[PDB]
Structure formats: structure tokens, C-alpha cells
Amino acid sequence: MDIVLTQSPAIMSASPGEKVTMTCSASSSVNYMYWYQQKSGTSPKRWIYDTSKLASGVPVRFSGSGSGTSYSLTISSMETEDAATYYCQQWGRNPTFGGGTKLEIKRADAAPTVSIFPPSSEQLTSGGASVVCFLNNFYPKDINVKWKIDGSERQNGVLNSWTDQDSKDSTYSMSSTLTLTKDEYERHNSYTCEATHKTSTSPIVKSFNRN
Amino acid sequence: KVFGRCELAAAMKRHGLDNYRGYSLGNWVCAAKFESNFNTQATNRNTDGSTDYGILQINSRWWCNDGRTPGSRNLCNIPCSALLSSDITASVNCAKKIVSDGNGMNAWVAWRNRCKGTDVQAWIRGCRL
Amino acid sequence: EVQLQQSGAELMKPGASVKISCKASGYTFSDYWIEWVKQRPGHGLEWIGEILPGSGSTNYHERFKGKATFTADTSSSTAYMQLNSLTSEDSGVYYCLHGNYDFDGWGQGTTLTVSSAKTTPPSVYPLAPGSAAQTNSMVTLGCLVKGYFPEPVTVTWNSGSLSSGVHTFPAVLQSDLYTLSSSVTVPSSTWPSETVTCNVAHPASSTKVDKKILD
């Protein structure tokens, strides 16, 4: 049997000092719930065991509770270092983990700094043309990037990548790359990167002309 | 190790299980057959976080201590790992305590579902005991 | 102090088998279970199974029966997990770990990549603003690290001296090749007056490129 654990909110943000509560719902009743904390790039750490017992090193601001098909993890007062993904787990006959709750740091809104770059001469000589656009240090993470070639919106050939929340200023950054062949690139003049963020009703536009 | 059927019957007999608390030898051999298929190393995770160990699948919540089971009682006062030896001594001693818990062999799920009410003598049949 | 030291990253082709080790220390090896977990981006964490060293006992999650096989060597206090019939779906990070009332630390994890793709060094391209770009107070530059395999690559700027103001984005896969970008931001008046170079290393191909950013 497969016991499904659904965690909510899937993603949430909190400011230091704020109370945080995340839930884990099971498709079937379980006797105990376990919780693990994982930070980007490192192994998970057991955080709470036997439903409410704190693992070694876990600060008292953390508490676990629940029964049956509903359990929760609560942080009395959010601290900066608590930012991470928390996974619940039922440790029965066939152990399963929830999808995790990603706890991020809440901060003031920040408009992205957008920068566009033409393909390097070296890549062009190789027959390729990648146009890169950086949208750095913005908040919240929600953001939309649109590419335009000679005024027309371009969808295909675009690949995006997002960084994890910055450990310094708690902002987010994004990279968007439009890749075309050397010939296709040479058959168009203007390239534009448009960033739409909640910090403004008007998108930030950055562009250049090959000619 | 995986015990032979008659080999185990002989071992259980020398350990005084024949007619122990009224349960004829066949009962014990039958229980081991359906609990672990005579495998001394068999283990199975349960649902309360407990694990069943050995040839008679002794539980870590009430009988042996495995150091990770909630509500541990360890009524047999023995580490669960000690119930996985090719020598059945530890498992037999604990089994004698389990059967005296107040429910007889009903303590064993496999015994209830596959041995109880059947011709358990068939499990020692043909064995030169 | 209990420790679990796993073996290094693995790169295997489809159909092969791989065995990952987990060396334990700081306690009586035969007295504790060592569990194993799989992690994949988006798919989350999955419990694989466990082994009790010395007794030879093992428990497997129903989803991994037949895929994983645990063994152990008490002479070196090392546990192993063998994954057979490898497929792309097996790519991910694998962990061995403890879970009990005495301790519950996890190993550092082992990255496994299953692909038919061949080891390829990255092409490294400099990213500089267009000659028509309007100068501001700050200037952002970058490096495009394209077409490499497998992961990972290490990117630094000016040999690490430029740590702050740097953003190295997660690589994206396509056509069995990885592509990544990194940006660095400094005062407009400091470039090109002061040189900026991105250092890209790809261990798998034993290659190291130092690309200076020019106008």
C-alpha cells in the first residue's frame, strides 16, 4: 500500500519573528509522523521524530504535533536560518515522504536589474548564437520574461534557470537564454528581453541591434 | 540460514517446545513456516514503526529492543538483533514468554491465519524425531 | 561521533549496475540499521530500504524490490547498495542514513547520472554589454558555459577574489548536454580598467578555462 502525504503550503515565506505552521495530510491514518529539514546542496537532517520529539541540535522554537491523518510542524518564531524545505514522513511498512514545504524568507519587494548580452564573437564563429538576459536580485520570485526578435515575440529556443534565494539579501535571480543558429541570428536585427515583475505595471525592456 | 522443515522440528523439540503450554510441536513448526519460511534472518517492517525479527518474527514494540521503535516494552528483555542467529535459542526463549502472555499462540498472526484449526501434525509428519 | 562516508559520484550507461558504499564509524556496526533514500528534483524523497549489518537482514520498500540490493562488509564496517538494470529514471542523489534513539545522521549523498551521452568539455563564452549599451553606475558581465557533460562544473571569477555580486545559475539539460551561465557585477568605472575573468573547471574532462571578459 502507498500512503500519500500531502504537505501545505507547498511554498511559503515568512519574516523573522513570525509564527510558522505547515501541515502534512496522509491518505490513510498513521501512528507517528517524522520531519526532516533540508537546505540546498546538503543532505536532509532528521528534525522531529515520533511526532513531537526534537532531534539533536533542533532549537525549542520547533514543535511537532498531530494524529491520524493530520500532522503539523510549527516554528514559534521564525529565524533566518530556518529557511529550508521541510519534509514529513510516515515510517511504516513502506515509508513515504511528503512533497515538502519550502520555507523562504520574506523581505521588501525589489525590482530586477535586467541586462542583455549579444552572442559572443567566439560562439558565432562556431556557428551558434545565444542571446543571454540576466534578471538579477528581485523579490518576490514570481516574474515573467518575454523575448522579441524584430518586435515579434519569440517562444521557441528559450531556456530559463532560477537561483535559490540569496543568503545575503534574500532576493532571487533569473537567467534566460535564447539560442539560434548563426544564420538565423544574422537574418534579424533587434533582440529584446522584457521582464514583467509586480514591482511595476510596465515591464523592464532591454535590447540591442545586431546592425 | 534457512532451516529444513524436519531439521527445525528436531531443534524445536530439543528446546522443549513440543506440547509447551499445550501446543504440540506441529504448531511451532507451522508458525515458523508461515512467519518466516524457516529463515532465521527474516525481517519485516510493521506499521507502528516496529519491525518483526527472526524465524518466529518477534516484534520490536512489545518483545525485543531494537533501539528505534516507539513505545518499546522489551518484555523478553533481549536485543532484537539477538533473535537473528542461526541458533534458535533466543527466539525459542522469547517465544515461550509470548505464548504465556494471555493469548496463547494467537500472538502469531501467521499461526492464526494458516495453522490454527488445521492438522498441524502434518508439519512434523515424516520427520524422524 | 558517528559518521557515514559515501563513495563518489557515478556516471553509468543504461542497462549497467552500480554499487555505492557507505563507510560507518563511531559505533558498533552490527547493532544498527542503515537505511537508504533516493532524491530527485521535483520527485522529492523516496525510501529505498535498509540493512542490519552482520545479520544480513534487509527490508525493502515495495517500489524498490528487485532494483536495489544491500550488502555489508563487517571487516571494514561498510554497507553497500547495488542498483541494477539502470535507466535514466535512476539518476539522482542517494543517501545512506541512521534513524534511531541514539543517533540519526545522514551520509553526504552520492550523485548518480545514467546516460548514454559521452563526456564533453564545456565551451566557455564571454558575456559583455553591447557597444551601444548605456552605461550606468554598475556593469554586469558574465560567462556562458555551454554543451558539457556530465555535471558538475565549477565557476569562479578572478580565481575566487570576486565572490560577492556573483550569480551562477543552475545548469539546464537538453539533447544530452548541459548549459549554464554566471553573472558578476562591479562598478562601471572598474571595467575594463580592472580585468575580469571567469574560471570554469570541468573535473569529468579534466579541463580548466580562464576566460577574460573583453569589450
Side-chain angles (χ1 to χ4, degrees):
Chain A
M1 173 180 263
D2 169 40
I3 301 179
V4 180
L5 297 187
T6 300
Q7 292 183 253
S8 60
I11 303 174
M12 71 188 295
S13 296
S15 304
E18 281 183 47
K19 181 180 177 179
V20 172
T21 301
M22 47 188 85
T23 58
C24 174
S25 179
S27 57
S28 295
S29 296
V30 296
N31 304 99
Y32 298 88
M33 194 61 81
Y34 300 72
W35 299 79
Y36 303 76
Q37 181 200 68
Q38 183 172 215
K39 293 187 177 189
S40 303
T42 58
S43 309
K45 295 184 187 65
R46 194 166 67 164
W47 216 242
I48 295 176
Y49 62 97
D50 294 3
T51 301
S52 51
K53 307 303 180 185
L54 299 189
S56 62
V58 181
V60 296
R61 58 174 173 282
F62 281 97
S63 65
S65 58
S67 65
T69 61
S70 186
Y71 292 80
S72 307
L73 175 156
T74 302
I75 310 179
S76 61
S77 182
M78 175 75 171
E79 291 301 329
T80 301
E81 62 258 52
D82 298 335
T85 297
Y86 296 78
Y87 293 103
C88 54
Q89 173 207 51
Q90 61 82 16
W91 209 27
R93 192 180 185 76
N94 287 291
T96 56
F97 288 96
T101 281
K102 197 174 189 304
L103 178 64
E104 305 186 298
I105 303 177
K106 205 292 188 299
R107 56 150 288 154
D109 286 358
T113 296
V114 189
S115 299
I116 189 170
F117 307 82
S120 74
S121 300
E122 294 172 290
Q123 175 182 35
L124 283 174
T125 62
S126 294
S130 289
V131 188
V132 183
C133 184
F134 290 133
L135 296 71
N136 297 336
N137 303 69
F138 57 95
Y139 188 95
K141 186 175 183 180
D142 181 54
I143 190 167
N144 176 285
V145 59
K146 183 196 298 181
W147 282 91
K148 289 179 179 178
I149 302 177
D150 293 325
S152 64
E153 191 180 311
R154 175 56 176 267
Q155 194 72 188
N156 298 61
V158 180
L159 289 171
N160 305 312
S161 179
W162 303 263
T163 57
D164 292 322
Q165 183 165 44
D166 195 79
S167 55
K168 182 193 70 180
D169 60 16
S170 296
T171 62
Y172 295 101
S173 287
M174 172 184 200
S175 182
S176 180
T177 304
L178 169 63
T179 297
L180 308 175
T181 62
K182 178 179 181 290
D183 175 62
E184 175 165 38
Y185 174 72
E186 300 176 320
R187 291 186 289 97
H188 291 286
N189 299 313
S190 73
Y191 294 81
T192 315
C193 177
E194 307 192 322
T196 299
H197 195 256
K198 70 164 293 183
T199 47
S200 181
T201 55
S202 294
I204 298 173
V205 303
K206 293 296 175 177
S207 63
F208 69 84
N209 297 305
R210 183 184 54 67
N211 53 302
Chain B
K1 60 172 288 182
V2 175
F3 266 91
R5 172 180 68 89
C6 285
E7 172 191 22
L8 180 64
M12 292 184 153
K13 184 189 181 74
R14 62 190 179 81
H15 275 86
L17 279 181
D18 187 19
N19 295 306
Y20 186 84
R21 217 176 189 284
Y23 286 103
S24 64
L25 190 62
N27 285 288
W28 305 96
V29 176
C30 185
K33 167 65 185 181
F34 296 107
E35 288 289 351
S36 66
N37 199 26
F38 305 136
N39 180 7
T40 65
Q41 300 178 184
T43 55
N44 285 289
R45 294 182 59 80
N46 215 289
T47 67
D48 62 313
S50 73
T51 298
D52 295 314
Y53 299 77
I55 197 150
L56 284 173
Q57 292 287 279
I58 296 171
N59 189 262
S60 66
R61 181 191 196 308
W62 289 295
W63 315 105
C64 59
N65 173 44
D66 69 2
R68 65 171 192 180
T69 307
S72 178
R73 297 259 293 181
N74 191 24
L75 293 173
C76 278
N77 200 290
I78 187 75
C80 299
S81 63
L83 302 173
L84 303 169
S85 172
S86 289
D87 184 309
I88 68 179
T89 299
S91 290
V92 174
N93 285 328
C94 182
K96 290 177 173 176
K97 296 184 182 67
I98 294 167
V99 78
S100 304
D101 192 57
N103 210 192
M105 289 195 73
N106 285 294
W108 282 278
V109 182
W111 179 80
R112 298 196 309 258
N113 306 328
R114 312 296 289 287
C115 307
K116 182 180 181 179
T118 76
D119 175 27
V120 297
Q121 191 282 310
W123 282 97
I124 61 175
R125 183 167 299 155
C127 298
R128 297 181 184 295
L129 308 170
Chain C
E1 175 176 289
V2 179
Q3 293 190 303
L4 289 180
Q5 183 61 40
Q6 310 184 209
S7 41
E10 298 286 345
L11 172 58
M12 242 69 254
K13 299 189 185 300
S17 280
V18 64
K19 178 177 291 177
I20 296 171
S21 60
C22 174
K23 186 185 70 176
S25 59
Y27 69 101
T28 304
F29 191 57
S30 62
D31 294 349
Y32 299 80
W33 287 94
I34 291 179
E35 306 171 62
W36 299 75
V37 168
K38 169 181 182 177
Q39 183 167 211
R40 285 183 296 168
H43 291 80
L45 302 171
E46 292 181 293
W47 193 84
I48 304 168
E50 54 184 3
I51 179 170
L52 180 57
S55 77
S57 298
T58 54
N59 295 145
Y60 294 93
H61 189 289
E62 60 194 327
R63 292 184 54 265
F64 283 93
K65 288 188 169 63
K67 165 62 68 179
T69 302
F70 305 118
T71 54
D73 185 325
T74 61
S75 80
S76 67
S77 294
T78 304
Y80 311 77
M81 170 179 73
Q82 174 186 285
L83 294 166
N84 62 262
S85 314
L86 293 174
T87 69
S88 58
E89 289 294 294
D90 294 313
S91 297
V93 177
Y94 293 81
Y95 304 98
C96 56
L97 55 129
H98 290 307
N100 58 72
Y101 296 125
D102 290 323
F103 42 82
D104 54 17
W106 284 47
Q108 83 268 32
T110 295
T111 293
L112 168 66
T113 297
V114 179
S115 174
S116 54
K118 40 192 172 300
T119 297
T120 310
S123 285
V124 184
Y125 306 121
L127 302 178
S131 302
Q134 56 289 303
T135 61
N136 307 297
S137 62
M138 298 285 275
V139 60
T140 293
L141 307 177
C143 272
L144 178 60
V145 185
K146 184 179 182 62
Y148 67 94
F149 182 96
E151 280 270 57
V153 292
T154 58
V155 178
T156 64
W157 288 90
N158 280 16
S159 300
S161 65
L162 283 168
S163 52
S164 58
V166 174
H167 288 301
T168 293
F169 302 83
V172 182
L173 179 62
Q174 178 169 293
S175 296
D176 294 318
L177 292 175
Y178 290 104
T179 294
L180 157 163
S181 65
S182 178
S183 73
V184 59
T185 306
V186 298
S188 298
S189 67
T190 68
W191 181 81
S193 64
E194 295 182 61
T195 68
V196 176
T197 305
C198 70
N199 327 103
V200 184
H202 188 225
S205 66
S206 298
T207 59
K208 179 65 176 184
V209 177
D210 295 311
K211 178 58 65 170
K212 181 179 179 186
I213 312 303
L214 310 172
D215 298 302

